[PDB]
Tab-separated table of C-alpha atoms and ligand atoms in Angstrom:
chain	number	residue	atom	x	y	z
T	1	UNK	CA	47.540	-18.421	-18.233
T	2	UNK	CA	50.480	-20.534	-17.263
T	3	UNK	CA	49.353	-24.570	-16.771
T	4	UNK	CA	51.505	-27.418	-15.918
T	5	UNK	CA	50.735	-30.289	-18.486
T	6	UNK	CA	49.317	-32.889	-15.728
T	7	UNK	CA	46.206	-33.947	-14.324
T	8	UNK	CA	44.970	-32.078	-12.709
T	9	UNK	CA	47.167	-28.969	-14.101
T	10	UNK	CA	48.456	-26.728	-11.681
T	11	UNK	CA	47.620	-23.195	-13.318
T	12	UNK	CA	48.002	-19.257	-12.441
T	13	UNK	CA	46.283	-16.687	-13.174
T	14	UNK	CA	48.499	-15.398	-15.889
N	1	UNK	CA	49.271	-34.439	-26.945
N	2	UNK	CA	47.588	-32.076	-29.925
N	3	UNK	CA	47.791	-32.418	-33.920
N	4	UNK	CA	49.501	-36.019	-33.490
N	5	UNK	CA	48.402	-39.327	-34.486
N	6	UNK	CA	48.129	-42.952	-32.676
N	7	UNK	CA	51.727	-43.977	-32.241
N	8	UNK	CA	52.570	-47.438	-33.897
N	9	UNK	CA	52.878	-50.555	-30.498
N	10	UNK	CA	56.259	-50.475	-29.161
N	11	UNK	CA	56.655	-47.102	-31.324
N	12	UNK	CA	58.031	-45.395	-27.719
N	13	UNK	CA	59.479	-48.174	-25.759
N	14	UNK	CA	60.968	-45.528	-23.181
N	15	UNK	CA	57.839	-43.760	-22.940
N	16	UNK	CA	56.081	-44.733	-19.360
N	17	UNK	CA	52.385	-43.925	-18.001
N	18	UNK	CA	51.944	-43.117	-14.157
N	19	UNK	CA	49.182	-43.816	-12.526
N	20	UNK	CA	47.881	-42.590	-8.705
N	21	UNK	CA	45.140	-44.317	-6.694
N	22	UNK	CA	42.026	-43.642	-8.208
N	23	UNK	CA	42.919	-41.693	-10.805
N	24	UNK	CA	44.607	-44.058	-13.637
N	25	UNK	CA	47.116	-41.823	-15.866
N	26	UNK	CA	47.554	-38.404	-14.926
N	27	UNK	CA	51.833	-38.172	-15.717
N	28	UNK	CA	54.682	-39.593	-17.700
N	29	UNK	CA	57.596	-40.326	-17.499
N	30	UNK	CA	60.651	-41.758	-19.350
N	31	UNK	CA	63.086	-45.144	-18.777
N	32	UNK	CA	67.040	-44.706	-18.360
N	33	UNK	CA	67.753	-47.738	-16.834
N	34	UNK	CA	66.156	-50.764	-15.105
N	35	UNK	CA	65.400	-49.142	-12.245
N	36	UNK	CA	65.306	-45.683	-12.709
N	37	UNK	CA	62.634	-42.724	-14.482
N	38	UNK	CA	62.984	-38.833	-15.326
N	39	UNK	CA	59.680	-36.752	-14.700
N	40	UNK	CA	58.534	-33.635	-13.987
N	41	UNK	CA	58.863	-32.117	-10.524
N	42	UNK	CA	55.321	-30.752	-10.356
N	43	UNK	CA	53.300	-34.125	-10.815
N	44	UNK	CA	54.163	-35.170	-7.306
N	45	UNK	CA	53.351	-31.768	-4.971
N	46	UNK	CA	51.085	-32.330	-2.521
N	47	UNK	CA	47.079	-30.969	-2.612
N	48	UNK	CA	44.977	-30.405	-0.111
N	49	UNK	CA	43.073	-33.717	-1.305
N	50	UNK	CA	45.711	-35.926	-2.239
N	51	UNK	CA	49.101	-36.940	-1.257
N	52	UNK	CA	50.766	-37.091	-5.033
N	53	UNK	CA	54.066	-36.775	-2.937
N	54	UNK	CA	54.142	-40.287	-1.745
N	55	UNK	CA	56.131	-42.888	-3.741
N	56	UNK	CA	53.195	-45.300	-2.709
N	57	UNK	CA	50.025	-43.555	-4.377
N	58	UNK	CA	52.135	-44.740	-7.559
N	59	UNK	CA	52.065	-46.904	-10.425
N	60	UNK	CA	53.935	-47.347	-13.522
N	61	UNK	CA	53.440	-48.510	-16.664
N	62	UNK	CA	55.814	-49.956	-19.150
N	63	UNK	CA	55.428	-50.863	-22.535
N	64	UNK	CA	51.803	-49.746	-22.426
N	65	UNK	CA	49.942	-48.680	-25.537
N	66	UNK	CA	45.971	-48.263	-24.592
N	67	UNK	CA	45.214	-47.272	-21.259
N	68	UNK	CA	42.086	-49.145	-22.098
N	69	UNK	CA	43.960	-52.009	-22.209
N	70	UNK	CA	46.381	-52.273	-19.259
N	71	UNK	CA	46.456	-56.299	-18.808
N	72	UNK	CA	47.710	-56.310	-22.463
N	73	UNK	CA	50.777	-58.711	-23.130
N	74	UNK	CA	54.033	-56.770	-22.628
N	75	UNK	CA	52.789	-54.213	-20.597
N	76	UNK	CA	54.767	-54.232	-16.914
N	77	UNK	CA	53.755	-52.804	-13.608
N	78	UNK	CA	55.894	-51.351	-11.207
N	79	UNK	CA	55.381	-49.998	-7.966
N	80	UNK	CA	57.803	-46.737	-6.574
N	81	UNK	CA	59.901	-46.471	-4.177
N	82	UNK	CA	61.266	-43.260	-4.026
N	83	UNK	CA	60.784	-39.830	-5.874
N	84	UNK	CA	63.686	-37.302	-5.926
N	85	UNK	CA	62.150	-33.849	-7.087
N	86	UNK	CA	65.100	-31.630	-7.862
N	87	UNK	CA	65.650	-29.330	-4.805
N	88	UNK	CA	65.992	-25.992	-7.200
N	89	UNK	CA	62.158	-26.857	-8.246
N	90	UNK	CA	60.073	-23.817	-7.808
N	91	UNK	CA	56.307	-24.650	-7.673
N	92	UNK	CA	54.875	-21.165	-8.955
N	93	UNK	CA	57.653	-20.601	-11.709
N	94	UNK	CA	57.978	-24.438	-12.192
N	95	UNK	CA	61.806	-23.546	-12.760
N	96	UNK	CA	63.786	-26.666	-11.875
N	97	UNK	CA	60.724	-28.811	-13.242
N	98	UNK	CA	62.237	-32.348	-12.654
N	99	UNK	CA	62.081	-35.607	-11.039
N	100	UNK	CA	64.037	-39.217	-10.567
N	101	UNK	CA	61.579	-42.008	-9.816
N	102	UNK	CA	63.154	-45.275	-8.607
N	103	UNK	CA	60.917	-48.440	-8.942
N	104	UNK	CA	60.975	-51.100	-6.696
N	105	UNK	CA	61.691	-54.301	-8.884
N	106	UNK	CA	63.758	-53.846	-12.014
N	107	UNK	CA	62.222	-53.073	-15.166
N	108	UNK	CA	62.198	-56.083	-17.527
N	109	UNK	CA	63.956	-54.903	-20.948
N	110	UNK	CA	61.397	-56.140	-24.116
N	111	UNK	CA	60.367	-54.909	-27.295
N	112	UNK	CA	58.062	-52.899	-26.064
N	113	UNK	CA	59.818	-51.913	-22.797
N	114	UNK	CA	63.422	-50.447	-23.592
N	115	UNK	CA	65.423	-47.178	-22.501
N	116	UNK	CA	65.924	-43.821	-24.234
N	117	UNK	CA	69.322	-42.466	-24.928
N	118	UNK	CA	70.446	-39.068	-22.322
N	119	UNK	CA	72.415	-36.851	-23.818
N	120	UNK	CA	75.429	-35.660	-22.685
N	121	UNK	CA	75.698	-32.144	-20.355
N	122	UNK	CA	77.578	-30.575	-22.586
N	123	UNK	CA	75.486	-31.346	-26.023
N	124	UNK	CA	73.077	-28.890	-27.618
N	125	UNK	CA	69.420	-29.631	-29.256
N	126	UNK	CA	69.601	-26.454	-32.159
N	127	UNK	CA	67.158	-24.343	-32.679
N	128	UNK	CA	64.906	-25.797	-35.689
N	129	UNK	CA	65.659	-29.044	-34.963
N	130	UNK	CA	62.400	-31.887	-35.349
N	131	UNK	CA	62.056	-33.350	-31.861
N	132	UNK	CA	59.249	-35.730	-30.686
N	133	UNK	CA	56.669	-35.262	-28.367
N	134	UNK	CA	54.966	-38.101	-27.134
N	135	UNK	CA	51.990	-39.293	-24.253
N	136	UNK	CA	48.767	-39.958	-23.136
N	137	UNK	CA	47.371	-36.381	-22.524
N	138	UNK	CA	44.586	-34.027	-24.157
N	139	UNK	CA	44.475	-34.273	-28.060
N	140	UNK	CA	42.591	-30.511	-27.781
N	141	UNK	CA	42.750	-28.212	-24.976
N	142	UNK	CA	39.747	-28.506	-22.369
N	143	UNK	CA	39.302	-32.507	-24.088
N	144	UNK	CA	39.950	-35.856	-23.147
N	145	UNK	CA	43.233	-38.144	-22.407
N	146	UNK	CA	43.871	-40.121	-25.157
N	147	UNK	CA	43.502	-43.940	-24.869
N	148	UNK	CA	46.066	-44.496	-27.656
N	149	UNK	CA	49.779	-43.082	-27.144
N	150	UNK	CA	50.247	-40.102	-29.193
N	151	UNK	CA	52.891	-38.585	-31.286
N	152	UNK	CA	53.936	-35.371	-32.637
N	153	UNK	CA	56.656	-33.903	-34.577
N	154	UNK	CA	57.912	-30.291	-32.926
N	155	UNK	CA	60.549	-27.885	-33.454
N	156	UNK	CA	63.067	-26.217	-31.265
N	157	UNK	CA	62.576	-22.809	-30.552
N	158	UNK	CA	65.063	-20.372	-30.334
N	159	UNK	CA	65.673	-18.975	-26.676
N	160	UNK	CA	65.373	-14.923	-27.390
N	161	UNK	CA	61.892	-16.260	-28.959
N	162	UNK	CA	60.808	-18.274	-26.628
N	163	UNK	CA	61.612	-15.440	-24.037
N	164	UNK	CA	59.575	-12.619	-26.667
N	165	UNK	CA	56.655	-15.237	-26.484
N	166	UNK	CA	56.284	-15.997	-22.819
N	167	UNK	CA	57.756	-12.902	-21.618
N	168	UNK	CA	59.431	-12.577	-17.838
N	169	UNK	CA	58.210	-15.977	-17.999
N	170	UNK	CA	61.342	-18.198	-19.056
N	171	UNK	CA	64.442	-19.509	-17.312
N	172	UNK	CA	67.567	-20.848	-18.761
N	173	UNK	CA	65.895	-24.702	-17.698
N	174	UNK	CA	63.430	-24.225	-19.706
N	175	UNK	CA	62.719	-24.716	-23.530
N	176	UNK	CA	60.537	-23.876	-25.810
N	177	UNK	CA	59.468	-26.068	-28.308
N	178	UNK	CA	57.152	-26.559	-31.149
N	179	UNK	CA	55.271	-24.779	-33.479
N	180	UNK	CA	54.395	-20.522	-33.353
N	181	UNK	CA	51.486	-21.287	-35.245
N	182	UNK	CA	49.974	-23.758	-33.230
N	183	UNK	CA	48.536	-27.101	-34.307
N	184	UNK	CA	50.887	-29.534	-32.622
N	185	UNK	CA	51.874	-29.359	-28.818
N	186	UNK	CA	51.729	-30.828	-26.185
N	187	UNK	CA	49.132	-30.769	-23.753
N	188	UNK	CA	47.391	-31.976	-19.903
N	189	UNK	CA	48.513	-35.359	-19.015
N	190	UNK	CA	51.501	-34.935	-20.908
N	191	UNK	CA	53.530	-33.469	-18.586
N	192	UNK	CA	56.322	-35.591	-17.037
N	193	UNK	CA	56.821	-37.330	-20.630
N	194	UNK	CA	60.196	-37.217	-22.620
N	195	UNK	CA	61.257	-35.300	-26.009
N	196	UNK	CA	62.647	-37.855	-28.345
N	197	UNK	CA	65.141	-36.259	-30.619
N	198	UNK	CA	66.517	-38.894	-33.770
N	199	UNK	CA	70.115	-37.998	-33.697
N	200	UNK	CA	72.903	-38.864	-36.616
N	201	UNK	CA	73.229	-42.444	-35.767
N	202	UNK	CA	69.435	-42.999	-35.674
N	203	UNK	CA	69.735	-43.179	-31.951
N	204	UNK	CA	66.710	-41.477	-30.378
N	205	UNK	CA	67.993	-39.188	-27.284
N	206	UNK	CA	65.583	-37.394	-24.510
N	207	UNK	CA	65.689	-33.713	-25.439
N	208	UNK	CA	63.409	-32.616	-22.351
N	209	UNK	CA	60.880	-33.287	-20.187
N	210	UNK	CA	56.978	-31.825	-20.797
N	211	UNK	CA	56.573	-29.364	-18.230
N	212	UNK	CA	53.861	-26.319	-18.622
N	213	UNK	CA	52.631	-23.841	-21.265
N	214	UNK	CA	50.220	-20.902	-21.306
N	215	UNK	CA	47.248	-23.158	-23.065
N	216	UNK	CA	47.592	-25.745	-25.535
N	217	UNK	CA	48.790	-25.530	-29.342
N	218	UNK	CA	47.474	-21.712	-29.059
N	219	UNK	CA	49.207	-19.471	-31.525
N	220	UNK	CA	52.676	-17.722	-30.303
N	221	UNK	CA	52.225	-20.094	-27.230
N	222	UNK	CA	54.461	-22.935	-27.943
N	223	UNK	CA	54.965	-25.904	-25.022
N	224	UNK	CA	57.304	-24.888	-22.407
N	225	UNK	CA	59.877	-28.073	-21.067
N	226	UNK	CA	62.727	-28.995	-18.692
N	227	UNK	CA	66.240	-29.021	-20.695
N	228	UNK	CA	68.321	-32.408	-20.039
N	229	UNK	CA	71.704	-31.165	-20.565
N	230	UNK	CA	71.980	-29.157	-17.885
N	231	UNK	CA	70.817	-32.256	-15.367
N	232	UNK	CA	72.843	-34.728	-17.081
N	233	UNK	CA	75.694	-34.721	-14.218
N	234	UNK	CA	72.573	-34.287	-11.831
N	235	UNK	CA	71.091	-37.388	-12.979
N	236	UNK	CA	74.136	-39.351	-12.918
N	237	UNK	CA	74.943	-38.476	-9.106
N	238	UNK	CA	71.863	-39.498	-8.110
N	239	UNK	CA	71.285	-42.417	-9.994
N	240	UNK	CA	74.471	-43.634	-10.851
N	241	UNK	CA	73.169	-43.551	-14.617
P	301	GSH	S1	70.846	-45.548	-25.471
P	301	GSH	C1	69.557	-46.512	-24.680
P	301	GSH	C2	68.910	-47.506	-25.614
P	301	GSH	N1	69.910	-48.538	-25.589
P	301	GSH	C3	69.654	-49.791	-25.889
P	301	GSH	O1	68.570	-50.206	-26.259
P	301	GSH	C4	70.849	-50.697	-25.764
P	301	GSH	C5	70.433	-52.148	-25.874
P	301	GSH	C6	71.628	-52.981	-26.284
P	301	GSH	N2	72.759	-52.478	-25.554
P	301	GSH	C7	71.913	-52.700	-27.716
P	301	GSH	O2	71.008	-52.874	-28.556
P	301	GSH	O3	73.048	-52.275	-27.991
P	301	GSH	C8	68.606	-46.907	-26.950
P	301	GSH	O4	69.036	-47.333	-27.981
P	301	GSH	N3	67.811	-45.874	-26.973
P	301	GSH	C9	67.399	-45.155	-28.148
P	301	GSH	C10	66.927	-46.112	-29.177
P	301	GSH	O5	66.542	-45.697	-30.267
P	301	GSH	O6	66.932	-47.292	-28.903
């Protein structure tokens, strides 16, 4: 469930 | 940024919006100097459909309030000329998460465009302590940039929590920092922005940098960012600030 806070996020699975 | 409210004009002076081509903003980022920003290290890896890398896809803005209203008086553009990403930056653990961005022609210092105090490498932001997080990004999770800069009042977390919450997920770089119960975080289009910690004097210093998190203002899933201690001496070898 991990997201970086930009636009667009870069996010994972977990 | 989530649970905050419209920040007053010139409330954040050191608080800067980055644009790419296309896109209007997408990061922050904060002023240290006239010609120098700190950001996050993950707003400028390349996709496979845009080159977020290159200093030229870039534009700041300083002193801006509504990204509605970008022509507004006091609001300066500046194009970039170079982007240092820190070369321990890990793009799946996002350890290492940040950046120096050096315009091209000098920032011009106003009421509404001014820098933010960096603290020094060997100072410590306590656990409990009320920071500031500030930007342009979602006010909910899954929402909407904000057109008004937002702000939010946060609290340190303690490292043996943050590493409980957000487990085999946390480095010594990062910190965790607002609320367990939720309600005020940070959030997408935040990321690259500073933590503004009032310190004795009334001086406001950059605590961090808004990096990731698992969600936004979830419970037990408080916003992850980049210390600024530990890059202090990094910054200044670099920049010369
Ligand atoms: S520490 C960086 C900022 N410095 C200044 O604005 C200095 C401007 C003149 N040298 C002066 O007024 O002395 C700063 O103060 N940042 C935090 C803040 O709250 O302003």
């Amino acid at each position: 469930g991990r997201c970086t806070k930009s636009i667009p996020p870069i996010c994972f699975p977990d | 940024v989530v649970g905050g409210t419209d920040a007053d004009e010139g409330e954040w002076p050191w608080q800067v919006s980055l644009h790419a081509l296309g896109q209007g903003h997408i990061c922050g980022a904060s002023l240290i100097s006239p010609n120098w920003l700190v950001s996050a290290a993950h707003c400028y890896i390349d996709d496979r459909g845009f080159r977020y890398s290159d200093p030229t896809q870039w534009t700041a803005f300083l002193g801006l309030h509504d990204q509605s209203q970008r022509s507004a008086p006091g609001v300066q553009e500046r194009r970039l000329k170079r982007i240092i990403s820190h070369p321990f930056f890990n793009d799946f653990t996002f350890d290492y998460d940040i950046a120096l961005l050096e315009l091209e022609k000098p920032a011009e210092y106003s009421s509404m465009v001014r820098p933010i105090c960096l603290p020094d490498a060997s100072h410590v932001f306590p656990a409990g302590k009320a920071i500031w997080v500030t930007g342009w990004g979602h006010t909910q999770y899954g929402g909407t940039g904000a057109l008004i800069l937002q702000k939010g009042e946060i609290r340190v977390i303690q490292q043996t929590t943050c590493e409980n919450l957000l487990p085999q997920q946390i480095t010594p770089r990062m910190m965790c920092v607002g609320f367990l119960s939720g309600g005020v975080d940070s959030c997408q289009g935040d990321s690259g922005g500073p933590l503004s910690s009032v310190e004795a004097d009334g001086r406001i210093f950059q605590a961090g940098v808004v990096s990731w998190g698992d969600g936004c203002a979830q419970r037990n899933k408080p916003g992850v960012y980049t210390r600024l201690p530990l890059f202090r001496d990094w910054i200044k070898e670099n920049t010369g600030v």
